[PDB]
Design a protein around this ligand. Structure first.
Ligand SMILES: NC(=O)c1ccc[n+]([C@@H]2O[C@H](COP(=O)([O-])OP(=O)(O)OC[C@H]3O[C@@H](n4cnc5c(N)ncnc54)[C@H](OP(=O)(O)O)[C@@H]3O)[C@@H](O)[C@H]2O)c1
Ligand SMILES: Nc1nc(N)c2c(n1)CN(C(=O)COc1ccccc1N1CCC(C(=O)O)CC1)C2
Length: 163
């Protein structure tokens, strides 16, 4: 059972300049509470984006997807494909794919659930932005209320499952 979790602007941006182009503390906490104790699978660029205090993500089995044989990621397991990341030698009840855009595109066909935070932030996309996957008619979801962060941004959480 594979889930994706991401935060996006309404416009669909998830990444810019090697990070996330908004600050939303309530969603960071939501991410931490949903993923704690589970396996988290990420692309190498997202692994490289994690700040030092969060690399590896504490309390989770970190799995990093790269084509670089010989890459060592201290505190994480390095695999050569997303299929490899989803065929662990020791199974986990819950596996969360935590980005980024390249890995989400690879994982979406294999996933049954998406947990999406929508951030009402005006972010005209730029050439090198990382963008969210698009959910087609094979996905249906439920939406929480629009909430306002202590920082001022409107946000809301969506929970999608494969039909
Ligand atoms: N808002 C959010 O929820 C969220 C979540 C996660 C990340 N982000 C942001 O998204 C950005 C990073 O995303 P990204 O799309 O640039 O990169 P990414 O998906 O995290 O990683 C891309 C890397 O994955 C590896 N890879 C891709 N396809 C592969 C395949 N088929 N087999 C093996 N390895 C494969 C490659 O590593 P090698 O080059 O090493 O071969 C590739 O360079 C950052 O700005 C980050 O902060 C945002
Ligand atoms: N895939 C996915 N989905 C989401 N909904 C969210 C995310 N990523 C990331 N989010 C944020 O708001 C932003 O995060 C961070 C941003 C900048 C620096 C550190 C962090 N974090 C510190 C604590 C770390 C941990 O210990 O987990 C995680 C990263 C929500």
């Amino acid at each position: 059972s594979v889930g994706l979790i991401w935060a996006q602007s309404t416009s669909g941006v998830i990444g810019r300049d090697g990070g996330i182009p908004w600050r939303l503390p309530e969603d960071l906490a939501h991410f931490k509470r949903l993923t704690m104790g589970h396996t988290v699978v990420m692309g190498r660029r997202t692994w490289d984006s994690l700040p030092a205090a969060h690399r590896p993500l504490p309390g989770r089995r970190n799995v990093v997807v790269t084509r670089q044989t010989g890459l060592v990621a201290h505190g994480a397991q390095v695999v050569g494909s997303l299929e490899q990341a989803l065929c662990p030698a020791e199974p986990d009840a819950a596996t969360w794919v935590i980005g980024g855009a390249q890995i989400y595109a690879l994982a979406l066909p294999l996933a049954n659930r998406c947990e999406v935070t929508e951030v009402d932030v005006d972010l005209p996309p730029e050439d090198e932005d990382a963008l969210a996957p698009v959910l087609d008619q094979t996905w249906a979801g439920t939406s929480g209320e629009w909430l306002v962060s202590r920082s001022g941004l409107r946000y809301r959480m969506h929970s999608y499952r494969r039909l």
